[model samples]
Target chain A: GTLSALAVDLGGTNLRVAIVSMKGEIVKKYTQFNPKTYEERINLILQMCVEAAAEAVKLNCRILGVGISTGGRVNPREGIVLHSTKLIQEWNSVDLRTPLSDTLHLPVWVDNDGNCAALAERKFGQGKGLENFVTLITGTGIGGGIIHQHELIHGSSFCAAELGHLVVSLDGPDCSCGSHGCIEAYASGMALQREAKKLHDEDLLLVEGMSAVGALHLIQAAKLGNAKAQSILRTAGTALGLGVVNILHTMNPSLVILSGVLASHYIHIVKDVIRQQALSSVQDVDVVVSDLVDPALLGAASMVLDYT
Target chain B: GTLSALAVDLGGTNLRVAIVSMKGEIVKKYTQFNPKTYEERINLILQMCVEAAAEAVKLNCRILGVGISTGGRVNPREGIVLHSTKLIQEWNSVDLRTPLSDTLHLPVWVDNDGNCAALAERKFGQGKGLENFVTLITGTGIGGGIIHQHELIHGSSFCAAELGHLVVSLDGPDCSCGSHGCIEAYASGMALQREAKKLHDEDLLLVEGMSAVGALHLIQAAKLGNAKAQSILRTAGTALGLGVVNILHTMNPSLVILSGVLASHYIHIVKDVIRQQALSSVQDVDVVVSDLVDPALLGAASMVLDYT
Candidate 1:
């Protein structure tokens, strides 16, 4: 029987569960949207895992272990949630591995979703064959993982590569981490929507018939060459460039892979900022967008493969 | 038989050469002051090495190889100087290793001085037995090295841990690297001296009859409880703290070891900023001043030992 991992991706918008093979194939999958509370999220994850495992058995794939990729701070070794962002309500100090192992009767591993995404890229995507690289995922908030010598850098406290919280401007704006002037404050999707609401309120666009002010609408306006929309993106891009500069000067990774919604859309603006600002020595550093499907899910499965 | 390395420390003002044993002991040493031109610097290093080697021969230590610790960007493997800061005039793309190795008839290794200092700490100083740590040296300019998993982080370009270039504030000040608002612009010894000149120009102190404005006087004044002097140090310390915050967030090293003139003086202020601003997860990181003598010299010697 083919060995497979029961992988779970716990994010703000959706919870995805799948039985993934050693070669990164998803044999059976299930996804649930809008996980309401901590208790509800755990139950849905368990139920999904059971269903996926049953399908895997029918398909002649033996489930090896469970691996999880989650947003917010986590101790991957202990498989415990240190803190959860506003996405998962009241998820702190929750032991995930023990409970999951008890029900599934399999060993478990957990890691930050950002790290999992990076692992996926390293294993099956853009970062293949590279010993040193970085991956930045700009979703609701900016987060990333650092790969040094072909392994993920989990710092002494197990919270390494909190790339979003890097300070760009001295006193720019407040961030979700309660820090001021972080790159997240200027570059995150949440930040873009916040600024988009201001532009909508100001009636800057003649075509203001959109139902709501959001990042998607703002990006679409920028695509149509709207000056104000372009301005906001440039500002955010510049902030992100400063953060990347910090990474380059400190880490000196050969490749920096960018992912998620915001990065895919405004990569040109980010590239421009880097060209104008980064040191000439590190100017040649390869920066690219990730091209992979369900990276978090694949990366969740990768953790088990790496260990066992 | 005792095997020793011919170690050379090429800095802005001084040239130091020593024969160092495998146990990190300086068997014989020589120091030269004020290296004017690239030729003069090269000749002085050669002369010092020759003299040190002669002394080592009489002391019954067999010379194994040559190791160099130099200020500037270097490819450790190739031993070529990529870029030199303003300190070493007319020094770029220079190959110091090939010539030194040819003349001395020994194999050679070279690395950035910051990395060498970090190696010293990891092997013989504060970071001993730790798999992850960082060291910041705040001399004429701020620089540092990163140690992860018992080795120095030589990024893809071998320029990892250029900590001084980390941007702290957007549009803060001009740095020697032609960048704006780098931590070096705010926290380096040169920056402190520049600020000290402003205080002297304003006649801020009643006792201004001693000497010209310099970082030493400013630090002394701060030590004596001078409020304005303390304020300047606080500003620099805060900027350094922001840079440290970037390190803490990204590297998450268990310990951050600080060295050089500026770090030893205003460490308390730096500590205060980290406590106030850094994430709670990394707040418990042990930050301390380096307690090693001639760390660069010893670390330069260490490279030969590590390779051979």
Candidate 2:
């Protein structure tokens, strides 16, 4: 392979890494689960990076740089972790880029996971060739990124496209952002689990005591024809559809992309509500599901590749 | 003032015409109530424009052009009315600019009223010097526009930023857009009146048969300590606030401006929900009320000024 970038995407439960080609292809890839604590996680990532760089050299692939994507509000230009409610404890103003660059002797870049997904999609996925678009990528929570007029919609604070926190109801349910009835409150995995638990049907993933039901289980239950599980997914789909309508009406992008594992699984339900709720002016918008490729890693790599 | 253009704003109930200066001043202005039919209304507007153009020439002001701000989904680039749910007889794809240009012997531009308000604000009002912003102006219904990277955000159809039609709740109420629980269904002046009538509160503008309750009357009642009226205002304000939160989270504009009489009237209520419900990234955005200083007309003039 030609020279490659070391890309990493940090999440709540997974840390994704990929050796990405300059052309946005994944040469090699791996993911590490949460390392129990911050110190262990840091050591694990640094060790992984060291090994990857060494392996690339052995394979005659020169390393270009490193790009990091994490689940938080980030200042890419400043290379600082601005803040994140996606995690517990305080993760603010951390000098993430400097320490990594100092250790690796290579340039580094940092950005939000949503932004990374956007960049990756723009370069290598369904977002290719689109001038203006938005991506909604979900995990335990819903996250968003925006591209308007071929430019990233970063605000003065360098934090735009916080779509998950958009309020869809005046008083539906509490959200992690302390808002009542945000998109995440209605559509995220956590919201679905809570709704399922409220049904008090032990048939729907009856994990107890601080352990949560998986969206996967609900999807499986729905496949097995459980009406309650199907109903909860419908609720989630309808809520997400409303959010999509809001996005189309407000941003007027020609394309609205659904990423993350759940988007593909439940897009059948999401598509109909979107059509039903779309304003006449926005009725023609093309809603599509992202293939859920290695965009986070690809997006991080594109940062150093200057592909955006 | 110096040279001027004939600025016409066609809202739901009134057709307002003014000779406006380049410096954002009104030289002369007049209004006409809606005629009984489309033919009558068109003739009235043409007659008014002919008179305004003649007046400008007689005053030796050297008329520049005609700029119209109308209540509809307008394609400014093509100078066509895509459609408007606000108007009667399926107001679809009207040749607005060409008709006026032929009648008056001057170049003409027609745009969404919301876009006009945004241009007016961006050039002469609160949004000046901002790179990104959004405007929500209400008359009979809510209308919206955006400025991103210091450019108008007309989508591919030149009909973006339909903020009022955004679904704020999934199962709340029906909207004119054929969607249920849209922001318009909850927050428009007509929607408020419907809610008030449901309350059976005669003190709160109990007008009959689609004549509708005056928002001013609601404000006055709320001031005079009418609890029901106050409650209705709070509901509308909260819905509008959720809309603000949505716009901020989606567009990440540093400023969000609300024009129209009701926005300024009960802004005291809308500000808190926005602050309380805004995503952390968007919490610090400056939400303000537009001064509503005849910018619709000024924005019309700015089009002639080529200030967009």
Candidate 3:
């Protein structure tokens, strides 16, 4: 009621902006396809921020600052994208904060999507009030954020917690990052789909279409009592568990929060497999699926929530 | 010069105590066998703390506290040992800090040996002033401490950074913790001795009798140009490298500091093996050998160096 901030989640092809109160309520929201050209996209993002602030102003809510959550490695201090395979064309070598701050006459903050997910969890989801936890995302690719004693571990290049790139089974499979057997190669949506295609090609399971989008459909089939889909999810769960054991051994975090579709769909099998394979020394860790609405967007707004 | 603490390294078989100045200097020192019985050992440890403080007082240094560093899971707040199989008889559910503080009429602090190793490095060794680094000990057993953003990562049970216990191979070797394929079984002093005896049993080298103490002798033989000794160290190095590769993938710390016997003896091979096995994405980590004299001892003293 007193103050609000404009929060943005800039994905690969869309921009979602909202006027968020200090308490994290989405006071007003808007989404639009990002302009194709580099300059147009930047202008569209700026325009969205201005409109959201105007909506908050109309409701007598003081505008604090704007926060941007994007798919690239962001220098939150400078609001610069270090690099990203996704969003490569529109956000290449761009600064997301400065131009918006100047045009809208407001403060700006930016962070990578993984951190945004973790921050959202820290503020209101599974990671709330926890000093140490890791947030993981699984969709087209695997990405994550490291929170140690509530502090983000942005590496020297502001790109720490590249979880997917960490090798799981050396020489097993090729990954987009030019590494072999990284967690991403074995556990991501695309990888699961690739495995699903094999099962379909072998006439073992029914896939609506041969792509990663069928991962949830495959899960739906499992829920509908398809033993074939269940077995496939079991394999995927084991791969995820293998990756997470490395995480538990390394970070020693009290909790591991899984987000996105895979976690929501197959957390039962995932937890079961992790306990089956993880070292007994660290098997006692807390693992949970996130239950936040628009976690990245909420996390972005929470960053500037303290401002009046 | 001013306030000081009695610093003690209460190891498994030996007890070493020193009157440590608030500035971290060893003013006076004494050593005694750890009491074989529960009461005797506790009393000896208590006596050593009091005597060390008295020695500091004679030198005009005001006693502020006592600090103990031990090889077990320690709760610094209540000074409780969660569990330790290695030091089973010496410390079972013991309160390390409270009794010493009350008897010596001073405040007291306690932490795990791994943490102490990292603290020592943070102050003066390979990890000096580093915000993120790991301190690894490689002696009778392999142990380590995790440092992230300049603070130790004490897990839920105060036993994080149990680097040795992490499984690198699915079914490599049985570990002390009832696990299989832990790096500790392959890279520790016992592991090295086991490897050394294999060479000696084949009449390829001399072991001076097969025992854990033979580790240093093998290193000695290697220093004297024994090819088989050099070959044994290479195997140990490769084992450690595989384990460290897991650390790199999970935690992504910029530095990994190696201490203890193997690091002191064959750091070159260890570093080479890690570089060879580490994924290309994270091959640039600064791996270095610690050159600290009594790092655990120095670390224990440094904790209470500024009691005021």
Among these predictions, the greatest lDDT belongs to 1
* B105-214 per-residue lDDT for model 3 (tens digits): 77788887778888888876778778888877876567778887788888765657877765554345556555555677777887777776776677766544433336
- Write model 1 residue lDDT over B30-105, tens digit each, in one string: 8877386889878877888878878888999998898999888898878898887776776789898888888888
Prediction 1 TM-score vs. true: 0.91
Q: Order of candidates by lDDT, top first?
A: 1, 2, 3
Tens-place lDDT per residue, model 2, B43-116, is 88899988887888777777788888987788887778788774434467788777888888888888888889
lDDT of 2 at A111: 88
Instruction: Rank candidates by DockQ, best first.
Output: 2, 1, 3
Instruction: Write the residue-wise lDDT of candidate 2 on A176-289 in tens digits.
Output: 767778888888877766776675455544333223556676776667777877777887788888888788888888887888878887577667887777767777877888
lDDT on C-alpha atoms for all candidate structures: 0.84, 0.78, 0.72
Better of 2 and 3 by TM-score: 2
Q: How many clashes does each candidate structure show, in the order listed? A: 0, 0, 1
Clashes of 1: 0
Candidate 2 stretches greater than 4 Å from native = A35-41, A196-212, B35-37, B199-212
- In order, the TM-score of chain B in each prediction is 0.92, 0.91, 0.88
Best by TM-score: 2
Pick by DockQ: which candidate is best? 2
Candidate 3 RMSD computed on C-alpha atoms after optimal superposition onto the true structure: 5.4
